[PDB]
Amino acid sequence: MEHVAFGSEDIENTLAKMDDGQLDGLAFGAIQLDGDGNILQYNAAQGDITGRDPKQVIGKNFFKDVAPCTDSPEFYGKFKEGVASGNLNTMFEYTFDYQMTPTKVKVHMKKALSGDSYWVFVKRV
């Protein structure tokens, strides 16, 4: 697989070189969002955690359509503030519970190297 550790300091540089196939080799879930919250990339490990089919969620809005349980000041609110400010680096635990067994995860959101792109990284806890 692709050897990159969750929470690594330079993760956005390392992931800038990966196509969708290489992203599927990561040990943790990875979602790339645009500044409106639309899903641009969604890897295999994320689909294993959540049950979603990675090919079908691309193009959907994460906060409106896919993950309403994240539409809250504690998750979406942090994303919105990061987009508005142009910088974002925050890690926190959360529970995903929409149409699935409630699953506790650690989330790391970080601005990507590309201009209007943001990463959401997820692992089980």
Ligand SMILES: *C(=O)/C=C/c1ccc(O)cc1
């Ligand atoms: C709450 O509704 C969270 C649901 C969710 C989180 C992450 C995903 O990749 C998919 C659904």
